Symmetry: none
Subunit: 86 residues, 12 copies
């Protein structure tokens, strides 16, 4: 099986604080992109967020949200990467 | 209005008891790649590993090590992705 | 503001156990429908599931999943109703 | 192949400090309707209320009370919906 | 010097593994009466049942239910009496 | 075996607060009667009081107090009734 | 104020075990007397028994049992004495 | 049918912030007598004191000390009596 | 410049499953001497014994007992020495 | 085997507080002697100190400190003696 | 009779609020050297740092990182030495 | 101030297991040397051993053991080094 995840992360500084532009190309078909305020990202929270997103992703029934939770995990992982990569 | 400070690219190519190949291109310069036994990949362990890698990454004196821990994080993050994507 | 939720719940018995056909008309626009095996529904689990779905729904960023989590809550609430209504 | 045992319709019409009107049509025969102060609706409380209502509902001797507790649950569930839908 | 506000009569007729008949006349208008298996009447359980019945009785919206919970309490209290009186 | 307990409870209001006149006819032979100040009766306390009165009643040796503890339980139960019946 | 308590304790040995004849003259008016099997008296229990008897004695209302609890304490204290005096 | 092994007489004469005189005749041979400040006599402390005196009394090598601890117990028991008798 | 208040001599002669003879000369006036089974001498127990002996020694009314507890401490201390010296 | 420990303890009072002159003759060959300020000796600490000194003494490897820990235990025991002997 | 597998030389030169210079020669090939603020060197922290560095060192995939963590340990150990040596 | 610690560690393999020859030159004056069996060294134990050795080293009084504890710490640190360096 295959899975490609491209993470492109850009930290921009604005007059108010630093912002993290997150671009994520899931399987070369879906682009996701979001701009978080970077300064208040705390690894522990994000690791917990992942714990919960898994708890839900494996107990979720619809033919819908098993992709819509996967994406939130991917964003959450972007934020984690930002912590280690800067 | 805003100024770019840095950019970070992480390319995750993941190819799947179960046995997992990991390819990571950090910043289009480093390739990292490894094979692992996927049966005993347990999210909680990997989240804890990240918690510890962070604890060390932010208390580590050497300019270098930070990078050698960053890479471990990146691998640890691969395993986490494998959980959500399969 | 307004919100309509229609819950239509039908318990059918099959040779193997009872099944709960859940039909949910959110805001007279979306129909959701699913068929759960009814016999192994435990209120406590479902109350916890709601706790988590809220934890995620209020910390979720995308313009996507704030509806895709709402729906899972709605299904989870159907199962809770089934417990009180039979 | 399967046989219908029962059907249950619950119609939730919810209309919104904040002050909340609740209308519930149980089984197209009973209407229940109430007004409440929405500022201090806290999900955890309402989940616990359900836990207790269940504890009583399944230990309650009277044929009747079960129905009078069912209705309380239904109202409690309205408040929970209000949290997720607004 | 003082004014009577209300009066309440509760008549407990209890007649006795062991199997227990309960007759209760509430307020000289309602009779309640039931049979139960007395071996597994455990005071702690019955005290906890009262704790819960109260928790619900004082949070219950319906004018009616209060009465349907009151009756359960009265039965629960019968079992407690049976413990002390035999 | 038989046991009759008659509970007659009257709430009177005096200038200072409400008072609960308790009249209890144990087995149509003993009358007990007491006037408690009603406003500071807390179910939890009274349930604990019962727990203790049982602990003592089942470990008590004399040919005396197994009736003199039974009576205190009966009063304590009156107070509990007052909570549910008003 | 005055209070006299006379404790006369006699340990007799019978074919089956030792028995503790307890004679207690409260205030030179009341004699209490009981014969306990001595071999299974455990200080901790008796100290707890006292703890409870106090909890009850100070929360007891009737014009009755404040003497009928006092007596049980006195017996309980006899058993404690037997432990230290043999 | 049974044989007397020993007899023990303990005579407690107690005479009452509050200040307490204690007279104890052990076995009609020893008199012990003391004065104490009764405001801060707290049952729990005295029960714990007994627990400790026992712990030592039953681990004490000297033939004598046992008696010197017995006496302390007897005084401690006086204070306990004072609580129940006043 | 300083004034001597008191002097205390303690002479420990210890002679060694294992079986231990203890000789103690307190203050060159009292000899204490005992034999014990050394296999089950466990430091923690002996430290706890000291903790308790102190608790009693400092709450003990009799002028005498203090001395009878002091001696027990001294023996307990012998066992502790035996642990460290062998 | 043999072991002699002589404890000679002298409490002197100086203008500033009491001082405890400790003289310890281990095995009639080693004299140890020290002057502690006596007023701040707390049994619990010293019992813990012993606990630790044992933990170390039984896990210590060198041909050196198994005598240099023994001595510290001996001093620590002097302080304990001072507590019981004054 | 025995065979040498490896040898490791670590040379610690430590030179001393307080401010600490550290020089370490690992294996006579690498020099590591750093300056630190010694007031807030707290042994417990440094022991915990070692616990974590080990946890990572033994779970680290890269052949290299192991060495970059080894060095951190060595520095952490310097601080520990400074505590004991000054 | 200055302090030199030279660690020379050699792992030899014998028929029975690996042995760690530890040579430690404290301040170019004292040599310490010991041969531990290497295979049963557990970091956690050794970190605890250090914790205790500090607890003792800072509460130790004699003009003796503040060097004889320092040495045990130094050995204990050798064992820790062996863990990171092999």
């Amino acid at each position: 099986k295959q899975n490609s995840v491209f993470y492109l992360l850009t930290l921009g500084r604005k007059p108010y604080g630093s912002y993290l532009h997150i671009k994520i190309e899931l399987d070369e078909d879906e682009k996701l992109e979001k701009e978080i305020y970077a300064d208040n990202i705390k690894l522990e929270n994000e690791l917990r967020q992942l714990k919960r997103l898994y708890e839900v992703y494996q107990s979720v029934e619809i033919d819908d949200a098993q992709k819509a939770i996967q994406k939130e995990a991917l964003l959450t992982i972007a934020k984690i990467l930002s912590v280690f990569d800067f």
